Nucleic acid binder design. Structure first.
Ligand SMILES: *[C@@H]1O[C@H](CO)[C@@H](O[C@@H]2O[C@H](CO)[C@@H](O[C@@H]3O[C@H](CO[C@@H]4O[C@H](CO)[C@@H](O)[C@H](O)[C@@H]4O)[C@@H](O)[C@H](O)[C@@H]3O)[C@H](O)[C@H]2NC(C)=O)[C@H](O)[C@H]1NC(C)=O
Ligand SMILES: *[C@@H]1O[C@H](CO)[C@@H](O[C@@H]2O[C@H](CO)[C@@H](O[C@@H]3O[C@H](CO[C@@H]4O[C@H](CO)[C@@H](O)[C@H](O)[C@@H]4O)[C@@H](O)[C@H](O)[C@@H]3O)[C@H](O)[C@H]2NC(C)=O)[C@H](O)[C@H]1NC(C)=O
Ligand SMILES: *[C@@H]1O[C@H](CO)[C@@H](O[C@@H]2O[C@H](CO)[C@@H](O)[C@H](O)[C@H]2NC(C)=O)[C@H](O)[C@H]1NC(C)=O
Ligand SMILES: *[C@@H]1O[C@H](CO)[C@@H](O[C@@H]2O[C@H](CO)[C@@H](O)[C@H](O)[C@H]2NC(C)=O)[C@H](O)[C@H]1NC(C)=O
Ligand SMILES: *[C@@H]1O[C@H](CO)[C@@H](O[C@@H]2O[C@H](CO)[C@@H](O)[C@H](O)[C@H]2NC(C)=O)[C@H](O)[C@H]1NC(C)=O
Ligand SMILES: *[C@@H]1O[C@H](CO)[C@@H](O[C@@H]2O[C@H](CO)[C@@H](O)[C@H](O)[C@H]2NC(C)=O)[C@H](O)[C@H]1NC(C)=O
Ligand SMILES: *[C@@H]1O[C@H](CO)[C@@H](O[C@@H]2O[C@H](CO)[C@@H](O)[C@H](O)[C@H]2NC(C)=O)[C@H](O)[C@H]1NC(C)=O
Ligand SMILES: *[C@@H]1O[C@H](CO)[C@@H](O[C@@H]2O[C@H](CO)[C@@H](O)[C@H](O)[C@H]2NC(C)=O)[C@H](O)[C@H]1NC(C)=O
Ligand SMILES: *[C@@H]1O[C@H](CO)[C@@H](O[C@@H]2O[C@H](CO)[C@@H](O)[C@H](O)[C@H]2NC(C)=O)[C@H](O)[C@H]1NC(C)=O
Ligand SMILES: *[C@@H]1O[C@H](CO)[C@@H](O[C@@H]2O[C@H](CO)[C@@H](O)[C@H](O)[C@H]2NC(C)=O)[C@H](O)[C@H]1NC(C)=O
Ligand SMILES: *[C@@H]1O[C@H](CO)[C@@H](O)[C@H](O)[C@H]1NC(C)=O
Ligand SMILES: *[C@@H]1O[C@H](CO)[C@@H](O)[C@H](O)[C@H]1NC(C)=O
Ligand SMILES: *[C@@H]1O[C@H](CO)[C@@H](O)[C@H](O)[C@H]1NC(C)=O
Ligand SMILES: *[C@@H]1O[C@H](CO)[C@@H](O)[C@H](O)[C@H]1NC(C)=O
Ligand SMILES: *[C@@H]1O[C@H](CO)[C@@H](O)[C@H](O)[C@H]1NC(C)=O
Ligand SMILES: *[C@@H]1O[C@H](CO)[C@@H](O)[C@H](O)[C@H]1NC(C)=O
Ligand SMILES: *[C@@H]1O[C@H](CO)[C@@H](O)[C@H](O)[C@H]1NC(C)=O
Ligand SMILES: *[C@@H]1O[C@H](CO)[C@@H](O)[C@H](O)[C@H]1NC(C)=O
Ligand SMILES: *[C@@H]1O[C@H](CO)[C@@H](O)[C@H](O)[C@H]1NC(C)=O
Ligand SMILES: *[C@@H]1O[C@H](CO)[C@@H](O)[C@H](O)[C@H]1NC(C)=O
Lengths: 659, 659
RNA sequence: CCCCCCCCCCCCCCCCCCCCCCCCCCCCCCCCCCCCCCCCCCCCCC
């Protein structure tokens, strides 16, 4: 029963409440216990409780005396119990409750008036019960109740009389999910004082019943209406007629298996702002299908279209000018679809668009012709996502229409070509370009000469070729900050590749082959490709096969903080190498061949750190080579994980395995 | 000028012969020098010479006084000189010479009688000279001359008169290669006393001139006749008519670009025993093409047939019963051909065949149907070679016709299947089966149950699968001696896999993954799969990833001599492991992680060796761990290559790199 | 001045083989999570 300010007793197998706790405890948690009964006589000591979570237990019934001992209780949680009987005196003395959870209590019928005696209630939960009617009392009560949950019940109708108790209550959420509701009575929602949101997820309504619901929702204050998994196979221009008289803003139609969308179906939602259509089975989107939605600010179409079938090749076709109506659209999530391709008028009319996602949106967008993004000429796009589209070639002037583009995501594709440099023309405001996980890229002298504003360039596992050109391909990128060149099997790097990139901060070169470039036997001398990077912060050089470190590689990294050198073949290091790393924070040298840690090399590096990773190193336990290191280990504040588990000497055999 | 019994002065840039050598020297070699002249006055000291190789020098002329100082000279070599003038007195005093080389001396014309004064000459060489006629004198001499070489000369005719000097000489070899001979005179070869072999390689004869040659060779004692690269495009039944009256045994027709072979072409060679046809362009072999060769004991057909061409797909077709005439054939080398496949009557009639080679003989022999080798039912084959035939499947009873087969070579193929065990039925006398470098093989319990007589089984780089069956697939192979299982990436081995193989001698398991089977943390205990191999001699366990050696793995290898354990991860070894290796000869532990060599483990192993390979090991220079080893290195007779080059300690840094 | 034969030496090209390092893929084994399922035991409600 650990407790400092709140009390936790979760999964402690308690049968009776403890009697030894501070009197001024505010939260008392007893989830996942076996409390058969809860006598109130044991709550005399606990008279300052605010939250009482006694859920997931086996309480049969409660007593009104429990509330007497708690004068200021605000939360009462009784999830997954056997409290199937309620009375007027059950919640009589409790009047400050702002939360009441009764989920999965097997409550069958609300008898007379269990909730009359409280007026400050905010949230009421009745999910997973055996209730058949939404009647919670006779007179009007629950003045401040804002959220009412009735999901997973056995309610088959919504009669007008049963909601007469909410004539003056502002319901912000009426959860009625998973209830086989098949009849709606007139005035059922008009009787509710102020209904702001309705949720009918997993409710088998159907199109005709959906139209009846919308008609019953006319001239009300609804703002949200979730109809997920409602088996809404087909919509028409009259399905949402009843919403013409309201101001609905959020509509959810996900998982409805919507086979087709009718012409002018959504013309009755001029105030819609958030529209959801993910995980549907739409086979054809008409030009006027999305008519009347000129105020939508966020449209989701993830898996909204039909998948390809070898039987018929029923690829979902999107007609031209289909998105011309979404004037105020600002976010289009359109991932995991099977569209044949982009047309010249597919995205016409989106004059306020700022985010377009096309991750795996097309079956085969092999070539990015310069006319592909012509429909996005007037769209002020900022972020474009094109991952997993199996793109194989990008022609010149492909992105010449996206003048406002800032983030381009071309990773996880099959782009194999030579970057002539003309592919990035027109990206005058580009900031980040992602190209990782491609087939193979061949850089040129002027590959990135047309995008001087670039700041991020990720090229992880792309099999870079001709990166060792005499003019550095990264020279025009004066504002570059993050560069990733990992898992490219790079062999040769020139010393002037990173020349002029003063603002570079994060550089990744792990999982490459640069061992030869740093050995003293390399013809032409070791390559010092890390000079001038005065603002470098994070350096990664894992699995490079390094066997020797030149003395003056880190001579100018005055602001280096994180350096990674694990999975290398380092055995000895030059003396006085980390002198300029005055602000180093994390040093990683795991899975190396280092046998000696001396002050002459690791002195300045161990000045003020916060992490250290030298786990799988064959240390040599000798006072000449490890004594300073173990003495430093003894007194320090640096975090060294697995210090006593893997920091084991290998030689001499006398100290073989001794930490 | 190193010399103990013979004198060598090759490539020493001598200008004059040395005057300080033992008097009783028998061989005096001066090849590749710059001896402008060779005065005989310097040979007074050297009067016991038998061989005098002064070739590849710049001697202009010699003097008869040179022979006077040498009474017993037998070899006179003058290759690549400028001795273009010969006289009767040049070789007068020299009479014991049994060898005389005059290659590339730019000799223009033999004037009168340069070789009369000797009668014991055996071999005479005159290659790469400017001679235009084969006249070497006027009268008859050279009684004992057996070999005469005249290759690469400028002889354009073979007149009868020019060979009148060999009326009583037995010529075993008359080399006339690379001479543009275009006319043969009657009686040219009949004038020669006893001609046994003629060589006309690289001589542009042609079919009509070949027939004229054969007619001129009638009723003579020739036995060999090499006509390689003679531009013999076509043969007919009359090309070799002139050989009907002789007893020719060896005939060479290689590189002749023989496009077609005529019907009954070789019916005139009943005594032929060695026939060569390699590197030809035969497009079709007729049934009666090889008629009359019922005495051939060795036929070579390597690249004898035309290669495939995409223009016409002119695959060389071999008619049925084409080899029916070779009754006494015993060796058929038939590699590197483009035959479409094997037929039911391709090899019929070979009742004495004992060696058939079909390495890369067919373009695509994908499936080995049980009817493929039906033509070899009565052939007493012993060795069959089927490498690089791109064989993809072997059906049951494929080798049911080869009852006398002993060696089967199926390696370097693409055989991917499951060895049900019925493929080896009928191999009652099989000894060796080669299957290395295949696609993938899946062994079964009774894979080799039908060939208990097997002794060799090579399975290198075949990706063995299901080798860890509960019954050992090698159990029926009671007489197995050599087993190769390298580069198969084998993971799991049962301890009874090699049970009962007492006669096993050589076992290869390198380049596999058996590290887990020997660690003490392996569930079920370490696998001791080397028990009962009392006759094991060679063991290979390279690149297995071993990290720990069980103590009693080599407890029964009483006759082990060569053990390989290089490229492993061994760091420590159990004490008293090599006790039973009383006859160990070579121990290989290179490229390991061993840091300590102690008498407790390497004592018995270093008893009496002949080789040791521990080059790339990070030894720990400490008197507790290396002192015994270095003391043993000091005094020993074992061969330790690169002892002072790679046996360098890694730790402590004081001894870093010191041998 | 031309045509050739040798000695020595330095580059260049092709192929074979070996070694170091690395990448990708795959196999074997282990571990950490997530979901689902089955069984045993205890405690309650109807
Ligand atoms: C363009 O769209 C694509 C696709 O939507 C975006 O890719 C997404 O990028 C984010 C950020 O990198 C990814 O989130 C990551 O999720 C991984 C999940 O790994 C988990 O690891 C735990 C470990 O226990 C496992 O148990 C889990 O099962 C799981 O494997 C997480 O490790 C990362 O830290 C990170 O949060 C996201 O997954 C990825 N989407 C897809 C489909 O791959 C891309 O960012 C976007 N471009 C832009 C510019 O926004
Ligand atoms: C069925 O026929 C096949 C094909 O004729 C036979 O395969 C032959 O097998 C022999 C013996 O294994 C091979 O000889 C080997 O040749 C290699 C050559 O390697 C060399 O290495 C030097 C190293 O400096 C290089 O310079 C050279 O260039 C060359 O690469 C040699 O290393 C071995 O020691 C061995 O002598 C032969 O090459 C091989 N033939 C072919 C075409 O691969 C096969 O034996 C035969 N089956 C039976 C049962 O006879
Ligand atoms: C939906 O929104 C419209 C526009 O905001 C509301 O119409 C206004 O309502 C307010 C409050 O009753 C009136 O003061 C305005 O005069 C109305 N303007 C117009 C042009 O009608 C409408 O009431 C909202 N719907 C509901 C059900 O409240
Ligand atoms: C109607 O739905 C919208 C969209 O789900 C809700 O807006 C989000 O609400 C969640 C829950 O409070 C927040 O976490 C998000 O930040 C909201 N998004 C935005 C863009 O504001 C909205 O609250 C719902 N309205 C009602 C009355 O339930
Ligand atoms: C919704 O509007 C679109 C746009 O007009 C309709 O598409 C037309 O369908 C007819 C009938 O096949 C075609 O002849 C026209 O060529 C289509 N128009 C265009 C621009 O291609 C669509 O039919 C309408 N929906 C319904 C249900 O009628
Ligand atoms: C690289 O970044 C710098 C700094 O963000 C950019 O310089 C700014 O340019 C704008 C517009 O010309 C000026 O208003 C700012 O005053 C500049 N900042 C400074 C500190 O001088 C520069 O334009 C960027 N380079 C590119 C090619 O976009
Ligand atoms: C080729 O071989 C045959 C058979 O060996 C030779 O014929 C024999 O020659 C010897 C020697 O002259 C005689 O004694 C035999 O009587 C011959 N027998 C027959 C059946 O003819 C023949 O001479 C050989 N060819 C040459 C050119 O010598
Ligand atoms: C005729 O040719 C055959 C085949 O080349 C010769 O027999 C081989 O001769 C070489 C050279 O002496 C030997 O190394 C081989 O061992 C011989 N092979 C066999 C099977 O004996 C034969 O010597 C040649 N005959 C003449 C007279 O030159
Ligand atoms: C050499 O003998 C073979 C075997 O008879 C001849 O092959 C025959 O060729 C004729 C003409 O095309 C065909 O009609 C026969 O069917 C072939 N025989 C067989 C058994 O297939 C071959 O023609 C002869 N060589 C020459 C030059 O005539
Ligand atoms: C395995 O090898 C042994 C020895 O070579 C074979 O035993 C010989 O068999 C022959 C024929 O039956 C006998 O004449 C020998 O006396 C046997 N030798 C010994 C030492 O007993 C045995 O047959 C071979 N196994 C197979 C299946 O062929
Ligand atoms: C509750 O309902 C009564 C009767 O309609 C009404 O007078 C009162 O204003 C309502 N409560 C609130 C807080 O509006
Ligand atoms: C559906 O469209 C038709 C065609 O204009 C129209 O007559 C009808 O009124 C629409 N449905 C509703 C419910 O308005
Ligand atoms: C680039 O776009 C223009 C305008 O559509 C077009 O005329 C031209 O052919 C395109 N270039 C290429 C290489 O396709
Ligand atoms: C060194 O690290 C400690 C611990 O995080 C921190 O308190 C101190 O300020 C650091 N010193 C400097 C100069 O940053
Ligand atoms: C350092 O050593 C002292 C003396 O043994 C010990 O008291 C102290 O706990 C050690 N510090 C750490 C972090 O272990
Ligand atoms: C040399 O030729 C003569 C004349 O024909 C002959 O008598 C003599 O026997 C021959 N020499 C030998 C060794 O046969
Ligand atoms: C070639 O064959 C024909 C047909 O039998 C025959 O008449 C002729 O004699 C043969 N040639 C020779 C040189 O015998
Ligand atoms: C095996 O050979 C016999 C005889 O030619 C044939 O009848 C049978 O079909 C062959 N078996 C298979 C599986 O082809
Ligand atoms: C040990 O090796 C030496 C050297 O080869 C050899 O002379 C000697 O006979 C060997 N001893 C035995 C018992 O084989
Ligand atoms: C062994 O050491 C002795 C003493 O230094 C030396 O004379 C002898 O040459 C050494 N043996 C070898 C094989 O180097």
């Amino acid at each position: 029963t650990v407790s400092h300010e709140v009390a936790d007793c979760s999964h402690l197998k308690l049968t009776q409440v403890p009697d030894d706790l501070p009197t001024n405890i505010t939260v008392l948690n007893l989830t996942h216990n076996q409390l058969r009964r809860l006598p109130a006589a044991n709550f005399t000591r606990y008279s300052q409780l605010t939250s009482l979570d006694v859920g997931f237990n086996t309480i049969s019934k409660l007593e009104p005396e429990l509330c007497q001992k708690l004068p200021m209780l605000k939360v009462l949680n009784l999830q997954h119990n056997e409290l199937s009987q309620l009375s007027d005196k059950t919640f009589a003395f409790c009047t400050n409750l702002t939360e009441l959870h009764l989920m999965s209590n097997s409550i069958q019928k609300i008898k007379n008036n269990p909730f009359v005696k409280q007026k400050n209630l905010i949230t009421l939960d009745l999910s997973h019960n055996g209730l058949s009617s939404t009647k919670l009392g006779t007179q009007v009560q629950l003045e401040n109740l804002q959220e009412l949950l009735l999901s997973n019940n056995k309610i088959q109708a919504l009669k007008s009389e049963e909601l007469d108790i909410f004539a003056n209550s502002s319901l912000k959420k009426l959860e009625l999910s998973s209830n086989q509701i098949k009849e709606f009575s007139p005035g059922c929602f008009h009787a509710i004082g102020r209904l702001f949101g309705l949720f009918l997820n997993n409710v088998q309504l159907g199109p005709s019943l959906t139209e009846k619901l919308c008609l019953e929702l006319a001239n009300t204050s609804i703002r949200n209406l979730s109809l997920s998994n409602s088996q809404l196979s087909t919509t028409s221009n009259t399905t949402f007629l009843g919403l013409k008289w309201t101001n609905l803003t959020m509509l959810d139609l996900s998982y409805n298996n919507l086979n087709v969308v009718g012409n002018d179906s959504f013309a009755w939602l001029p105030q819609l702002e958030y529209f959801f259509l993910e995980y549907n089975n739409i086979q054809h989107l008409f030009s006027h299908s999305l008519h009347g939605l000129f105020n939508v600010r966020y449209l989701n179409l993830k898996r909204s279209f039909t998948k390809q079938s070898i039987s018929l090749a029923s690829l979902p076709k999107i007609d031209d000018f289909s998105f011309q109506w979404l004037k105020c659209l600002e976010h289009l999530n359109m991932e995991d679809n099977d569209i044949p391709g982009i047309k010249s008028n597919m995205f016409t009319g989106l004059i306020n668009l700022k985010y377009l996602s096309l991750s795996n949106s097309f079956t085969s967008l092999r070539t990015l012709t310069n006319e592909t993004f012509v429909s996005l000429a007037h769209s002020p796009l900022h972020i474009l996502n094109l991952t997993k589209n199996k793109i194989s070639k990008i022609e010149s002037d492909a992105f010449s229409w996206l003048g406002h583009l800032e983030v381009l995501d071309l990773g996880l594709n099959e782009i194999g070509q030579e970057l002539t440099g003309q592919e990035w023309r027109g990206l005058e405001n580009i900031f980040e370009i992602y190209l990782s996980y491609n087939k193979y890229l061949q850089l040129t002298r002027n590959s990135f000469a047309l995008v001087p504003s670039l700041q991020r360039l990720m090229l992880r596992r792309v099999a870079l070729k001709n990166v060792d050109s005499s003019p550095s391909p990264f020279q025009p990128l004066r504002n570059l900050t993050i560069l990733d060149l990992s898992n490219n099997n790079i062999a040769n790097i020139n010393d002037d590749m990173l020349e002029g990139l003063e603002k570079l901060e994060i550089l990744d070169l792990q999982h490459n082959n640069l061992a030869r470039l740093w050995k003293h036997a390399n013809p032409g001398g070791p390559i010092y490709f890390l000079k001038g990077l005065s603002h470098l912060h994070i350096l990664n050089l894992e699995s490079n096969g390094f066997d020797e470190i030149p003395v003056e590689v880190f001579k100018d990294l005055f602001e280096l903080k994180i350096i990674d050198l694990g999975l290398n073949n380092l055995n000895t290091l030059p003396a006085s190498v980390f002198n300029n790393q005055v602000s180093l924070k994390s040093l990683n040298l795991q899975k190396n061949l280092i046998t000696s840690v001396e002050k002459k090399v690791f002195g300045p590096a161990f000045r003020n750190l916060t992490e250290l990773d030298m786990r799988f190193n064959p240390f040599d336990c000798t006072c000449e080579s490890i004594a300073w290191f173990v003495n430093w280990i003894n007194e320090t504040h640096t975090n060294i994980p697995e210090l006593s588990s893997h920091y084991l000497c290998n030689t001499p055999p006398h100290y073989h395995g001794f930490p």
